[PDB]
C-alpha cells in the first residue's frame, strides 16, 4: 500500500489473530536487507507471539542503520524508536519495517504458519495432529464425531481417534 512518512508519530498496528507468514518475505527478489537480532527468521516462524508490531516509513538511499543495540547518531537517536534490547527484525528493499515482538500475558495469537506433512494411513507413524502427539497406525474409522470435537478418547483417557484437521475425517489410532 502506497504513501508512507513520519517517524515520531510513525504509524503502528498490532498484528494479531492471523498466521504470520514470514516465509514470503525472504524469497522476493526486492528485499535487499533482512535481519534478525537474537533468533533466526525461520526460527521466528515457529515461535508463537501475542502481538506482532509493525511500522513503516520512507527513507533516503544512504540509510543509517536501524537500531539494533541502541545505534548511535543524528537521526538515529533524534527521531525514533530506539530499542536497546531489540529482539526485532529490520527489513529493507530497493522503506523499512522495524518489527517488535510482544510476548505479554495474553494468549499468544499471531502464531507460526505451522507447515503440514501429508497423511499416510494403514502403517506405523509418529503423528502430530494439531498438537496432539504420539505413535500409532492411523486407519479409516466409522466413528461420527460432532462438528466441534477434535479427538476421540477411550474409556481410560487414551486417545482412540482423531479428526484430521485439513480433511475433516475421523481416523482411529491403534
Amino acid at each position: 500500500a502506497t504513501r508512507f512518512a513520519s517517524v515520531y508519530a510513525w504509524n503502528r498496528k498490532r498484528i494479531s489473530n492471523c498466521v504470520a507468514d514470514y516465509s514470503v518475505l525472504y524469497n522476493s527478489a526486492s528485499f535487499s536487507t533482512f535481519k534478525c537480532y537474537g533468533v533466526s527468521p525461520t526460527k521466528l516462524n515457529d515461535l508463537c507471539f501475542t502481538n506482532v508490531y509493525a511500522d513503516s516509513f520512507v527513507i533516503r538511499g544512504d540509510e543509517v542503520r536501524q537500531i539494533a543495540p541502541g545505534q548511535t547518531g543524528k537521526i538515529a537517536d533524534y527521531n525514533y524508536k530506539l530499542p536497546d534490547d531489540f529482539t526485532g527484525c529490520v527489513i529493507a528493499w530497493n522503506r523499512v519495517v522495524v518489527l517488535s515482538f510482544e510476548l505479554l500475558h495474553a494468549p499468544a495469537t499471531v502464531c507460526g504458519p505451522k507447515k503440514s506433512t501429508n497423511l499416510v494411513k494403514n502403517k506405523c507413524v509418529n503423528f502430530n495432529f494439531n498438537g496432539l502427539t504420539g505413535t500409532g497406525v492411523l486407519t479409516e474409522s466409522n466413528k461420527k464425531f460432532l462438528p466441534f470435537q477434535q479427538f476421540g478418547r477411550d474409556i481410560a483417557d487414551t486417545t482412540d481417534a482423531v479428526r484430521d484437521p485439513q480433511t475433516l475425517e475421523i481416523l482411529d489410532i491403534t
Partner: antibody
Framework: QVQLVESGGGVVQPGRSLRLSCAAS????????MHWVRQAPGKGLEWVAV????????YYADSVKGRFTISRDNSKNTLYLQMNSLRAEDTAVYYC????????????????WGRGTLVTV | EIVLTQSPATLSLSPGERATLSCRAS??????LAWYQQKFGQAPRLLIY???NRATGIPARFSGSGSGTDFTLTISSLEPEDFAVYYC???????????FGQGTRLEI
C-alpha cells in the same frame, strides 16, 4: 590469512556418492553465510547451495534439489557438502564461497571464492 | 523466469578504444542486476550493480546504462587491467535461485 581452502576433489561413477569439504580460516566461520557454486567445464558459474551464518535454514538450486546436502560444523570451523545420485553433468569445479553481507539474510552476493576443487564422473 | 540474453558473442579491439557489450534482459528486474568480470582462472568480482552504480574498488572508467529490458556496459579505454570475460547476473523469486548469462569474451 582470511582465506578458504577447499578439499575432497575426486572421481566417482554415476549413481554413487561423494562428500566435499571447505576449510575456512582467518575470519569467524559461524558469523558469515556460505555458498557452493559449481563451474562445469567451459561453462559459467551455477549456484548449488547456500547457508545463512547460523546454518538454521538452507536453500538449494533446482538442479540439485533433494540430491545434495550442505552443512556447517563450527566445531572444526569446517563446511561440508554431501552428494547423492551423482550424474554425468555433475563434473565441475566446486567453488565454496563466502557470503558478502554481515548478518543479512538477503543471500545475494559472493564476495570471496575458494580456488575450486575438481570433481569428475 | 529471467533469462539474460548477451550480445555480441565476442569483441575484438585494440586497447584504449571503446568497448560496448549489451545484455538484453527478458523482463524488468527492478533496481539490482549485476555485472561480473572474470579473468582466466581468477575469482569473479562484481563490477557494477544496479546497472549504473559504481561498486567499490572500481575505477571510474566502467559505465553502464539501462532499465527494463535494455542493459548495456561501456568501457572508455581498455588496459590489460580490464581485459577479461564478462557476465550479466541476477537473482529470482520464482523458485529461489539465480540466473547468470552465457558470457561475452573480449579480444585484442
Amino acid at each position: 590469512q582470511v582465506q578458504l581452502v577447499e578439499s575432497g576433489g575426486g572421481v566417482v561413477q554415476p549413481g554413487r556418492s561423494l562428500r566435499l569439504s571447505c576449510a575456512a580460516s582467518g575470519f569467524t566461520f559461524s558469523s558469515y553465510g556460505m555458498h557452493w557454486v559449481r563451474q562445469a567445464p567451459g561453462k559459467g558459474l551455477e549456484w548449488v547451495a547456500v547457508i545463512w551464518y547460523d546454518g538454521t535454514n538452507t536453500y538449494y538450486a533446482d538442479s540439485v534439489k533433494g540430491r545434495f546436502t550442505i552443512s556447517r560444523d563450527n566445531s572444526k570451523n569446517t563446511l561440508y557438502l554431501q552428494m547423492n545420485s551423482l550424474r554425468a553433468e555433475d563434473t565441475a569445479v566446486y567453488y565454496c564461497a563466502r557470503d558478502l553481507a554481515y548478518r543479512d539474510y538477503v543471500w545475494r552476493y559472493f564476495d570471496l571464492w575458494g580456488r575450486g576443487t575438481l570433481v569428475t564422473v | 523466469e529471467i533469462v539474460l540474453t548477451q550480445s555480441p558473442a565476442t569483441l575484438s579491439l585494440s586497447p584504449g578504444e571503446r568497448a560496448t557489450l549489451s545484455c538484453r534482459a527478458s523482463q524488468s528486474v527492478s533496481t539490482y542486476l549485476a555485472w561480473y568480470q572474470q579473468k582466466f582462472g581468477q575469482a569473479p568480482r562484481l563490477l557494477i550493480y544496479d546497472a549504473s552504480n559504481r561498486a567499490t574498488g572500481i575505477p571510474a572508467r566502467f559505465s553502464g546504462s539501462g532499465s527494463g529490458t535494455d542493459f548495456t556496459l561501456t568501457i572508455s579505454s581498455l588496459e590489460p587491467e580490464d581485459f577479461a570475460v564478462y557476465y550479466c547476473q541476477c537473482r529470482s523469486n520464482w523458485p529461489p535461485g539465480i540466473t547468470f548469462g552465457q558470457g561475452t569474451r573480449l579480444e585484442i
